[PDB]
Each structure stands twice: as structure tokens, then as C-alpha cells.
Amino acid sequence: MTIKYLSSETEKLMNQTVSGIDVCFTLIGVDDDSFASGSKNDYISDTPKFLDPSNVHIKATLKRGGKDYVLFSENLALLAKYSTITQGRDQWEEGVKLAAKEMVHLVYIPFSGNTNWPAHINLKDNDVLEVYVNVVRGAYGAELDANACICDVRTSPSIGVEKFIPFMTSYSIRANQATDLVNLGNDVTRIALLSMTNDVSNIPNAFTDVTLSSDRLDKNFNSNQLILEHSKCIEDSVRSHANEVDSYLIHEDIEIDSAKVHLKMNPAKIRENTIYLVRSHFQTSLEILQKAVAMEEKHQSADIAKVPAT
Amino acid sequence: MTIKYLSSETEKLMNQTVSGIDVCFTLIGVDDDSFASGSKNDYISDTPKFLDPSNVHIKATLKRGGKDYVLFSENLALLAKYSTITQGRDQWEEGVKLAAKEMVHLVYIPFSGNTNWPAHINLKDNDVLEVYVNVVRGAYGAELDANACICDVRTSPSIGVEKFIPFMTSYSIRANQATDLVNLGNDVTRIALLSMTNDVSNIPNAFTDVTLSSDRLDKNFNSNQLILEHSKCIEDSVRSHANEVDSYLIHEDIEIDSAKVHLKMNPAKIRENTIYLVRSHFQTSLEILQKAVAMEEKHQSADIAKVPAT
Amino acid sequence: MTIKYLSSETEKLMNQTVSGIDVCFTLIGVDDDSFASGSKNDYISDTPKFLDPSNVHIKATLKRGGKDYVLFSENLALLAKYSTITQGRDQWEEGVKLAAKEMVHLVYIPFSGNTNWPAHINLKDNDVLEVYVNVVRGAYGAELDANACICDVRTSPSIGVEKFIPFMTSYSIRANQATDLVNLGNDVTRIALLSMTNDVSNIPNAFTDVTLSSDRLDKNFNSNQLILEHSKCIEDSVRSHANEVDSYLIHEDIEIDSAKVHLKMNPAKIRENTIYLVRSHFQTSLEILQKAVAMEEKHQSADIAKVPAT
Amino acid sequence: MTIKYLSSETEKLMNQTVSGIDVCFTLIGVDDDSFASGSKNDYISDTPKFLDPSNVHIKATLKRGGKDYVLFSENLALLAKYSTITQGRDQWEEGVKLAAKEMVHLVYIPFSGNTNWPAHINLKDNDVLEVYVNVVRGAYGAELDANACICDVRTSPSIGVEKFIPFMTSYSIRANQATDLVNLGNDVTRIALLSMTNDVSNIPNAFTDVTLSSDRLDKNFNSNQLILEHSKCIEDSVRSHANEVDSYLIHEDIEIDSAKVHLKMNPAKIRENTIYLVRSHFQTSLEILQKAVAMEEKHQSADIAKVPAT
């Protein structure tokens, strides 16, 4: 699809094995000095010279069996940081040149979030997947133009062995909080601590305790131990693939959780710049498990039937 | 009744067919220049000069069959905005002159909240409607004196063909919350989005995506589409009858609902000047349906038997 | 029909389904500076320039089944205020221009008076609805010519499923009464308090208690509670649509009534310049109900018959 | 959805309960001094500054049992006036500001046209609603840009108890016609007389004889009686909620009729800047009634099913 600036458009999917949503951009400069440098993404204000990804609110929803289910609580900057916590930083935050006045920005946003462990939403005769995208004022700023173009859903191969329905949501802690116990959902599977600024040289100065409590695990975190704990999913020699005031916690089916964030001080930012909490839970059911068994048996019988001999 | 400043008062109704609560006022100014302007109601602070209804805490309840049913969760400003989103706006926002130092303020708060479609609480020999009104510190201010008088509950005709018991409550979304998947009640029938602020001219600036998901309907709401939807219930040519950041969603028997409200940012106010989500649900039962059918048969047998000829 | 000044005219209607009476005017001024301002309709005295509708005596009567029934106790100003207590005030009280000398006036006077809930007089082979209208001395005053043209009775669709015979009458309280218990008829259904003067700016100064009692309901009215109770019919933010010393009490078939009007003081005006209690009752019976049910079944049988397929 | 300039887009709905079509707009001014003044809608020419909504075509069609049913004869200015003869007029004719260069325009167009009493098109396993919208040359003009947007069709609650498929059509009387007999359809239920100009101070001058002849009624209309007649659906004190050269006739199941419009002279405008006769008839059948009765018994059975106790 393509959406104008100051515009909204839906999207419907009837029979697909859908996983992951592309977001492409296409920025058009006014003069050559508007792209003499790289298009560093503004978030708040005070350098509104380029893209501002906060002002797109992608909602996904599933109509399934006469009911509704909600995905993607509507912030493209949150989905950009959460997808590119182990990706990005060249093809999204600083973009790819193509011409003298053309530069793009690209993210793959999977439904589970994890690039190496995806979900695959199946579809049938009466269910439908609906993707609703808004573009509002202040999405491109000064040096960009109102002839930008965006992109749409990507599909996936028939890995529709789907167990579940991957939910994804935020918490958005306030300005000068000192301690906040953030109770989270049932089956949470992944927890991430995202920040969208680096006001000074790359020193965190934000966290001083993090307590993840469950039935399956306790994990207590010093600020230095967070800097280590972000560096388990990256096997590059560099410790981070995003802005170095963040942290990250991948798991496998936590059954209950409370994430206590024990902040430092006023360098926890103000005016919604500050650190957001993003969790990616799911729901599942017996009939989806039975359709998973039926789909695996149909593909298995097809593969056994389609091999002759020799 | 009349209730003094810094005082309590309760109320019991034993045999009525009751619908709605009057709230009157009587402001006695210290000097004429206190009424040189109108008596426009302050809400937060910084001009404690006229009536503030954020301090009056009406709590109603129904003692019925030895159980209890709590009504009207305690804010006169909440009930005044929710009732008079389509009514009022002059005899509550401004006042009605009576003398140089006398001006009143008047609202009718029906139990369903809809003045065009009310409910009618029937009573019997044992059940009792217990209404309770407080007036607490800091509700009149600097220009006014401590000799005001407020009012009481109004009745209704024998339209006690009643099907249900209408409850009414709020949610009061957070300070700088950007997204909230608000779960709502079972059978909700009326949903309103209230707001009590204008920092700038009459531009919404707060709502940017509203999703009303239910069993019998799904409606997605763009920020312009809210301004349309509020203009359906008012057949006047003006687009609103309240402070113009509100919106209003009247319905009929929603089976279950998740209303996902997605705000923009920090222009959603903090410190209780923020957006209030108000719903008016109900309970019902088979024996209350039997009382409705039997009462209609009593009235219809009366109107047949009481008409002679010519 | 049309009636000259200092004249009279009768009217008969034999086979219609009739609901209400139109009254129009056509004022032709003497000079343009007479209508330099709008024709503010004078009532009392002392500025006898423009139209005075106090001097038109519309009497309706229903010759039905060999019997007579008297309707509309003869004041066009009373029927204008009582009908257009929520209507009018621009096409009646202020007029609509057509030329430099031509300005018209308009009211619609339904039989029940409630424009959204009317009554529809049916007719048969022998009965006849008669309308007798006088126009007497002093109907136009100084700045108007003697050549106005008025209107006649309107009709209605066959929604003559008629349940009753709607009557309407007035009281005309005395000069400086302080307390008047006005006992009323059997089945009254609508009560209003009109007033035809405003001595000062819009301050009521006329009412300190109104007591209404029945078998069916029971209401007590403080001076402020009258201003609230008037505002349950008008969805506009402004509290009233007339001289702002009025009030209005609409119901559903009050079974018996006494209305104790308890006035403030001497500003209850003298010499018919005063507060008029106006009610709109009816009389019904069994054979009228039998005509109603048989008419509903014939219309329903026709509507079922005339819808073939597809 | 959105539709670009010189563009066209359809829309298919398969299983809903659909009623009413939103139309939103978004106007982007070149400089701030364009929207320094209000975006008043042009109609013909010679100041094509803002939105000219006589060019947008909206056609609705209903595929049902392999057949076709055509709705909405392709004119936005027709549907805007016929919707906003008692609604709108501020969020459509005057616009609502969102920014210094951004103003919107809103109408709700229900399928009956009466916002207070709509029909509700149901849908099942084979039928489909197809809304086809065109936007053509010369719709925005001088003081705007080529980057505007629209909105989509709204849904409805399950009031799909539908008795009838509503049709809607216009007549478009000539440039200097003065006498016309317009034979209407079978069952018409709503008749309106629109006018889309104001040449001088808003003296009506347009109609002088409207003769409505039907089965259930036979009404005549002088030009004064029309200005009365439009003031029966409004209960504001102002006599009209449109541009005051119109008139209006809402009804209930006129069995067959012909309306005879008799214009005066020269003030019957030319170039189709003139009076349009618009009616909103319907077609229905026995099997649609059978699905209506079966649907009402379904929802009644569910409402008695889910009422537990107490």
C-alpha cells in the first residue's frame, strides 16, 4: 500500500500465512544540502530536520471466529526499537542512500518480535487480519517533502504450525519516577527496556536495580549486570546493536511476572523521552493446537506421498 | 434538602418510582465585582473564586433484598459532565442570575444518564434508595461566602416498567499515558469520553485513535470520525454541547467490550484535568423481568377497566 | 380561509384525519421605517404599534356522534405561547421578512400541543370538526395596514389510530394572589406555566413554590427546580425558548391532579398580564378504542397485502 | 480509505450490519492567509477558493441474490444537503480547524437520511455492498492543494432487524421551470425540497405552490405554510438548520403519491444552481420480513437466555 502524509489507510488479509510487517520509507529532499548529511531520526523536537517515527500508529487486529483480538499498540518508534534491538542502526536509524535526494528507511516488524523465532498467523475461510495505519502531523519535519511513500505487510512460507496469538504491548513509565513495580501479563516470553535518547556521552546513568520475579525464575540486576545481560543475544564483538542506554531480557514461557524497575534519578528523562517497557506475551487455545496438529499431518502426508523411489 | 458547607448529609427513599437527582446551588457573593463577570466554574486551582464541583462527593446505593448495589462513584463534576454532555452548558458552566450577589447552578443527573431514554428505579416496602452527599473543604473559594444551599433527588411518573438497575462509573485514564486497552463491563449501553480542559483554542489534540470492539459491532474511530460521531446525537447545527475536546458514544446493549483508547502524547493533561472514560452499564434478572411484566399488566388492566363510554 | 380585520369566519371539516391548526399572518406595513426594525409582537399596552395576537379568539368544536365537544378556549396568544414554549420565538415572536413592507408570522397549534407526540382527530360519515375564529378591534395597532391574510386547519396522514379526544384549557390567575390551589381535571397529561411579560432583565421573580400532586406522581418544585425541570425537553444549551419567566411540566396521563401555585410577591403582575396555568387533557372511551383497534388492523392488513416478493 | 485527486475507488463489504456513510475531508492550504478565513463551500464558479463538493460522486449498490439495487445517484452536494437539512452545517459548510493550514469537513449520510431513524442493511453469505466513489476535476480549486483525503463507510449496531431496502433519488428541476407534476414512486416515506444558493438576503421567493397528493393524505402548501412546515422537525427556536431557502416533508409510509411543484419565475435559478426535489423511497418483500421476524426472535431468545438470577 501507499499512504499520503496526513492520511490513514487500512489493510485486509483473507487467506495468507502472514508473519512480519514491512515498513519502508522514501524521503525526498528539498535541496542537496538537506541530504548532505545522514537522516538521523528526530524523536522529540528541536532538530525537526528529518523523519519523526513517533507519529505513526500501526494497529493490527485479528477477526477470528466472530471475536476480535488486538495486536501492536500503535507506535512505530516503539516497534522500531523493539524490532531493531538486535537489528537496525543503519537501515532504519540512519537509512540507505539511493540518489542525490532519495534516502529510505526499512524495518521488518515480526509479530513475535524475535527475528530467529517467529510466529506464523494462519488464515481460513472466514477470519481476516486487519492492519490500520495512521500518519499524522509532524511525521517528516522541515527538510523533507510531502511526496513520501510507505509499504505494507510481508507474507511468510507455510510454516503455519501456529500454536498461539502473539500480543505485544508497552507500559511507558513517567518522567521522574524513582521506583515502579510494573506487574505484567500471564505468559510474557520477552521483556525489553527501551530508551530513545543519548543526551550526553554513552553512559547509562538510568538504572540502579531491576528485579524480574516469577515462579520460574528470579533475576536481580545491577546496572553493570544489565550491560552484560544485553550482550547474550549478540555474538558480535561489540556489545550493543542499538543505543547504549538500553537493556533486554529474552525468555521462554514465563508463567507469571512482576518487573520492578528501580530507577536512579532525574536523568530518567522527562516528557515521554524516557525509558519504556515493552513486553511480548501471547494467548493460545486447544482448538488452535488441534488445527496445528491437523496442519502438520496434512503437510506430512503430502511429503510422504510426493516421493517416488530411488 | 439543603446542605451547608463543610458538612455531611444522607437521604433515604422508601416507596417511590425514582429517576434522576437534581443538584442545585445558590451562590452568595461577597461583593458585586465578584459577579462583574460570569460565574465560570474553576476546576483545578489558581483562581479559587467560584464553585468547584470536584469536591462534592455524591454516592448513591440501593439496599435491595438484603444485598447492596453501589451507584455513582463520587464526583459531582464527573456526573455533571457525563449527564450534561448534551444538556446544560449554560446553567452549569455559567449560571443563572437572580440578583446582584445571587446566582445558581443546576444539573439533572438521570440514573441511566440519558434524559431522552431513562430508567425508573421501582421500590417496595423493604428496599431503600440511600443517597449520600458530602460537601468538603475548598469547594467555594475566595469570592464566595459559606451560606450556600444545594439540593436533592427528584421523582418520576409510574414508568416503573423497569427492566434493570443502571450502574454508572468512570475510569480516569492516566497522566501521560499514550495507550490503554481499557476493558469495560458486560452490558454497557453508553460510553462517553469526557475532558475538562482547553489549554489552547478549540482543537482536540488528544485523541488520535479510538477502537471500540464488541460482539455486535466493531467501530474504529479516526480523530475526525470522533468529531462526526459526537455530531449525531445533537440535532443542533453546532457540533457540540460541551467543552470541545469531548466525544460521545451512545449504544444499545453491547454484549461485551474492549475499548482501546490511544492518545497522542503529553498534551493529554496530567493531574485530573485529563480524559475520563465514563460508562453506564446495568444489572438485570428474571424476577425483575417478572415485576416489569406484572406491573404493565396492572396498568393495562386499570386503563381498560377505567373507561366507561363516550 | 382568510379573515379581514373586524371580522369572523367559521369552518367545517367532514372527512379528514386532522391534527392541529395552522395560524399564519401577512403584515403589510404602512411605511418602510415601520419595519426598519422587526415586528416585536406587542401584548399589553403602551406601544400599540404592531401585531397584538391577544385579540384573536380561536374556538374549535367537534360535533361527534350526535354530541358536541368544546375545544380551544379562545386566545391565539395563549395557544401561541403554549404550543411554542419550545418552538417559535423567531417565526412568531420576531417575524420573517419577505419585502420592505411585508413580514409574516407563523405558529402551528397541535391538538395535544406536543409537536413530537400529537393526536389525530378522525372523522366519519356524520361527524364534523368545526373551527370558529374571530378577529376583533385592536388586532393590528398603529403601524400596520388592515389587509393581513391568515391561515386554516392542517391535515395529517392516516395515523388516525386515535385513542382519545384531546382537550385544552387555561386558568388565568388573578392579580396579586400569593397562594392559589388550582384543582384540575381528571386525566391531564400536560401542564405548563406561561407568562407574557418581562418587567426587568431575565430574572424570574415570580415563583417561590409549585406543588403538584396526583395518585400517580407527586412533585415539589423550588424556584431553582423549576428552571431545571423546564430544561428536560430542550436539548439546546440555552434553558428556555420564550419569555424567561416560564416553566413547563410534561407527563404521561396523570390520573387526577391538584396544582398549588405558591407565588412570590406583587411582581406577579396584575390585570391579565400574569401567569397562565395551561393544561391539555383528554376524554377517551371504549368505542373510540374499538375504532382504533379496527383501524390498526385494516392498515396492517393492507400493508401485509401489498408486498409481493423479491 | 482515502481517495486522491482525479481518482476513483470502490469498496466491498461482505458480512456486516451497515448503515450510514461517513465523509471526512482534510484541506491543506498553501499559505496561512488562505485559512485565515473560513473554508466556505463554493458551488458554481468565479471564486473557486475552497472545496466544491458538487463534483464528488458517491454511488452505492447492493448485490443480493445475483440481482442489483442502485442507491445514491452520484452527487455529494445532494447527499450533503439532504443529510444536513436538520444536521451538520458547521462541520460541513464552515469547517473545523485543526491547524493553521489544516481544516476538515464532515457529514454523516445515513441510508434513510434520517439520522434519528435509520435503516440497517444486513449482509449474509452471498450478498455484498459495493460503495463506488469518484473524485473528479475541479473539486478543490485555487486556494487549496492536490493532497486532500476522504473517509469510509461506518458500521452500525445490530439493529439489523431490517424491514426494507431503502432507495434514494433526486429530480433536479429545470432552470426556469415554473410548473411541474412529479409522479413519485410507490412507497416514499420522505420528501424534501433542497436549494443550493443564496443570491440576496435570505428571502425565500422560490416556491409558491406545493401540492402533495397521496393516498393517505392530500396536503396543499402556500409558501408561508412551507416555512411553517420545516419548523416541525426542529425544536430549536431558530426556524431552520440549513440555508434558509429550503423546505422539508418527513412522513411514514405514503402508499402512492405525486408531488406537484409550482415555482414562480426568475428566482428559480439557472445552471442547476436551483431547487432539487429529493425523495427516499424503499422496496421490501415477504422473505425480507421473514428474516426480520426470525432475527428479532433470535435476539429476543438470547436476551432471555443470558439473564442469570438476583
| DSSP conformation letters of B44-56 | SSS-TTS--TTS-
Neighbours of B217 (CB within 10 A): 19
| Cβ-defined contacts of B52-56 (< 8 Å, 24+) | B52/B77, B52/B138, B52/B139, B52/B140, B52/B141, B53/B77, B53/B80, B53/B139, B54/B139, B54/B272, B55/B135, B55/B136, B55/B137, B55/B138, B55/B139, B56/B23, B56/B133, B56/B134, B56/B135, B56/B136, B56/B139, B56/B150
Amino acid at C172: S
Which of the residues D147, D151, D155 would you substitute to probe the A interface, choosing the one with the greatest number of A C-beta atoms within 10 Å? D147
Who contacts C206 (Cβ-Cβ below 8 Å, separation ≥6)? C195, C245, C263, C264, C267, C268, C275
CA angle A267, A268, A274 (to 5 degrees): 130
CB-facing half-sphere around the CA of C156: CA atoms within 13 A:
23
Neighbours of C253 (CB within 10 A): 18
D167 and D277 in contact (C-beta within 8 Å)?
no
Neighbours of D48 (CB within 10 A): 17
Query: Rounded distance, CA A102 to CA C21, Å?
Result: 74
CA angle A290, A296, A300 (to 5 degrees): 145
The C-alpha cell 550493543 sits at: A240
D61: left (phi over 0), alpha (psi -120 to 50) or beta: beta
Query: Rounded distance, CA D267 to CA D177, Å?
Result: 10
N-terminal to C-terminal alpha carbon distance within chain D: 47
Query: Rounded distance, CA C261 to CA C250, Å?
Result: 16
**CA–CA distances in Å: residue A26 to residues A41, A99, C237:** 14, 11, 49
The candidate with the shortest Cα–Cα distance to B162, out of B284, B255, B300, is: B284
Distance from the D36 Cα atom to the nearest Cα atom in chain A, whole angstroms: 19
Write out the three cell numbers for A233: 543475544
The helix/strand count (H/E) of chain A reads as 3, 19
Distance from the A147 Cα atom to the nearest Cα atom in chain D, whole angstroms: 9
DSSP designation for D34: T
Amino acid at B36: A
The C-alpha cell 444536521 sits at: D87
According to DSSP, the residues that pair with C25 across neighbouring strands are C105
Distance from the D1 Cα atom to the nearest Cα atom in chain A, whole angstroms: 5
DSSP SS3 for D80: helix
Residue A225 host element (H or E): helix A223-229
**CA–CA distances in Å: residue C134 to residues C54, C111, C137:** 11, 19, 10
The candidate with the shortest Cα–Cα distance to D217, out of C20, C157, C19, C15, is: C157
Query: Rounded distance, CA A226 to CA A262, Å?
Result: 13
Of C154, C157, C310, the CB nearest to D285: C310
- Residues C224, B151: C-beta atoms closer than 8 Å: yes
Amino acid at C54: S
Alpha helices in D71-113 (DSSP H): 76-83
- Residues D310, B65: C-beta atoms closer than 8 Å: yes
Neighbours of D98 (CB within 10 A): 20
Residue of A nearest to B175 (CA): A174
The candidate with the shortest Cα–Cα distance to D259, out of D193, D201, D210, is: D210
Domain ranges within chain C, ordered by starting residue: 1-310
A170 and A276 in contact (C-beta within 8 Å)?
yes
Distance from the B222 Cα atom to the nearest Cα atom in chain C, whole angstroms: 26
DSSP designation for B116: T
A277 and A47 in contact (C-beta within 8 Å)?
no
Write out the three cell numbers for C291: 375504532
Distance from the D110 Cα atom to the nearest Cα atom in chain B, whole angstroms: 10
DSSP SS3 for A175: coil
Which of the residues B201, B213, B224, B245 would you substitute to probe the D interface, choosing the one with the greatest number of D C-beta atoms within 10 Å? B224
Counting every residue, how long is chain B?
A: 310
Query: Rounded distance, CA B260 to CA A147, Å?
Result: 31
- Residues D231, C91: C-beta atoms closer than 8 Å: yes
Query: Rounded distance, CA B47 to CA B31, Å?
Result: 16
Amino acid at B203: I
B22 and B152 in contact (C-beta within 8 Å)?
yes
A277 and A259 in contact (C-beta within 8 Å)?
yes
Neighbours of D136 (CB within 10 A): 12
Query: Rounded distance, CA A248 to CA B217, Å?
Result: 39
Residue D182 host element (H or E): strand D180-183
According to DSSP, the residues that pair with D278 across neighbouring strands are D170, D192
CB-facing half-sphere around the CA of B52: CA atoms within 13 A:
18
Distance from the A271 Cα atom to the nearest Cα atom in chain B, whole angstroms: 7
Write out the three cell numbers for C152: 386554516
The candidate with the shortest Cα–Cα distance to B142, out of B37, B31, B7, is: B31
Neighbours of A180 (CB within 10 A): 14
DSSP designation for C53: G
Write out the three cell numbers for B186: 458486560
Q: Using a CB-CB distance cutoff of 8 angstroms, which residues of chain B are in contact with residue C204? A: 98
Residue A286 host element (H or E): helix A286-305
Residue A112 host element (H or E): none
Query: Rounded distance, CA B217 to CA B213, Å?
Result: 7
Distance from the D99 Cα atom to the nearest Cα atom in chain A, whole angstroms: 9
Does C211 lie at the interface with D, CB-CB under 8 angstroms? no
C257 and C214 in contact (C-beta within 8 Å)?
yes
Query: Rounded distance, CA A97 to CA A29, Å?
Result: 12
Residue A283 host element (H or E): strand A282-284
CA angle A140, A146, A152 (to 5 degrees): 80
A-facing residues of D in 269-288 (CB < 8 A) are: none
A56 and A139 in contact (C-beta within 8 Å)?
yes
C74: left (phi over 0), alpha (psi -120 to 50) or beta: left
D247: left (phi over 0), alpha (psi -120 to 50) or beta: beta
Query: Rounded distance, CA B289 to CA B164, Å?
Result: 8
Query: Rounded distance, CA A121 to CA A156, Å?
Result: 9
DSSP SS3 for B181: strand
Who contacts C205 (Cβ-Cβ below 8 Å, separation ≥6)? C199, C245, C264, C265, C267
C154 and D226 in contact (C-beta within 8 Å)?
no
Does B75 lie at the interface with C, CB-CB under 8 angstroms? no
Does A174 lie at the interface with B, CB-CB under 8 angstroms? yes
Query: Rounded distance, CA A58 to CA C290, Å?
Result: 63
Query: Rounded distance, CA D59 to CA D74, Å?
Result: 5
Does D225 lie at the interface with C, CB-CB under 8 angstroms? yes
According to DSSP, the residues that pair with C96 across neighbouring strands are C104
Query: Rounded distance, CA D61 to CA B27, Å?
Result: 60
Alpha helices in chain D (DSSP H): 76-83, 223-229, 286-305
C179 and C263 in contact (C-beta within 8 Å)?
yes
Query: Rounded distance, CA D12 to CA D132, Å?
Result: 9
Query: Rounded distance, CA A223 to CA A245, Å?
Result: 10
Write out the three cell numbers for A257: 511476572
Of D224, D228, D286, the CB nearest to C309: D286
B-facing residues of A in 35-64 (CB < 8 A) are: 54, 57, 59, 61, 63
Does B87 lie at the interface with D, CB-CB under 8 angstroms? no
Residue of D nearest to B67 (CA): D310
Q: Kindly provide the b/e burial profile for residues C260-273, where b requires at least 16 CB atoms within 10 angstroms of the residue's own CB.
A: ebebeeebbbeeee
Amino acid at A4: K
Of D26, D147, D152, the CB nearest to A146: D147
The candidate with the shortest Cα–Cα distance to A70, out of B220, B264, B229, is: B220
Of B24, B151, B307, the CB nearest to C286: B307
Query: Rounded distance, CA A177 to CA A188, Å?
Result: 24
Query: Rounded distance, CA C274 to CA B289, Å?
Result: 48
The candidate with the shortest Cα–Cα distance to D92, out of B259, D82, C95, A176, is: D82
Q: Using a CB-CB distance cutoff of 8 angstroms, which residues of chain B are in contact with residue D26? A: 224
Write out the three cell numbers for C237: 444549551
Q: How far is CA C253 from the centre of its chain?
A: 18
A55 and A137 in contact (C-beta within 8 Å)?
yes
Query: Rounded distance, CA B118 to CA B154, Å?
Result: 13
Residue of D nearest to C310 (CA): D285
B58 and B107 in contact (C-beta within 8 Å)?
no
DSSP-assigned letters across all residues of A17-65: -EEEEEEEEEEE-SSGGGGSS--PPP-SSS--SS--GGGB--EEEEEET
Query: Rounded distance, CA C196 to CA C85, Å?
Result: 11
- Residues D285, C303: C-beta atoms closer than 8 Å: no
Query: Rounded distance, CA B115 to CA B234, Å?
Result: 13
Q: How far is CA A198 from the centre of its chain?
A: 20
Query: Rounded distance, CA D106 to CA D80, Å?
Result: 9
Does A308 lie at the interface with B, CB-CB under 8 angstroms? no
Query: Rounded distance, CA B237 to CA D107, Å?
Result: 12
DSSP-assigned letters across all residues of B246-285: -EEEE-S--SSEEEEEEE-STTS-STT-S-EEEE--EE--
Query: Rounded distance, CA C272 to CA C276, Å?
Result: 9
* Strands (DSSP E) found in C45-170: 56-64, 67-71, 96-97, 102-109, 121-122, 128-135, 165-166, 169-170
Amino acid at D22: D
Query: Rounded distance, CA C132 to CA C58, Å?
Result: 6
Residue of C nearest to D244 (CA): C96
* Strands (DSSP E) found in C155-299: 165-166, 169-170, 179-183, 190-194, 207-213, 218-221, 247-250, 258-263, 276-279, 282-283
The candidate with the shortest Cα–Cα distance to B303, out of C119, C280, C168, C284, is: C284
Residue B102 host element (H or E): strand B102-104
The C-alpha cell 416515506 sits at: D189
The DSSP bridge pattern shows strands C258-263 and A164-166 to be: unpaired
DSSP designation for A230: G
D185 and D279 in contact (C-beta within 8 Å)?
yes
Dihedral Cα A86, A90, A92, A98, nearest 10 deg: -150
A170: left (phi over 0), alpha (psi -120 to 50) or beta: beta
The candidate with the shortest Cα–Cα distance to A226, out of A242, A250, A247, is: A247
C103 and C49 in contact (C-beta within 8 Å)?
no
C223 and C305 in contact (C-beta within 8 Å)?
no
The candidate with the shortest Cα–Cα distance to D166, out of D216, D120, D231, is: D120
Is C in contact with A (3 or more beta carbon pairs below 8 Å)? no
DSSP SS3 for C182: strand
Query: Rounded distance, CA A189 to CA A253, Å?
Result: 5
Q: Using a CB-CB distance cutoff of 8 angstroms, which residues of chain B are in contact with residue A272? A: 176, 178, 265-266
Who contacts D253 (Cβ-Cβ below 8 Å, separation ≥6)? C303, D187, D189, D216
Query: Rounded distance, CA B152 to CA B22, Å?
Result: 6
Q: How was this structure determined?
A: cryo-EM
Of B91, B97, B309, the CB nearest to C287: B309
Amino acid at A268: A
DSSP designation for A121: B
- Residues D99, A5: C-beta atoms closer than 8 Å: no
Neighbours of C277 (CB within 10 A): 19
Distance from the A229 Cα atom to the nearest Cα atom in chain D, whole angstroms: 45
Query: Rounded distance, CA A71 to CA A168, Å?
Result: 6
The candidate with the shortest Cα–Cα distance to B265, out of B207, B186, B183, is: B207
Q: How far is CA C206 from the centre of its chain?
A: 22
Resolution in A: 4.0
Who contacts D310 (Cβ-Cβ below 8 Å, separation ≥6)? B65, B67, B285
- Residues A4, D147: C-beta atoms closer than 8 Å: yes
Cβ-in-10-Å burial (0-12, 13-18, 19+) of D181 comes to exposed
Query: Rounded distance, CA B219 to CA B214, Å?
Result: 9
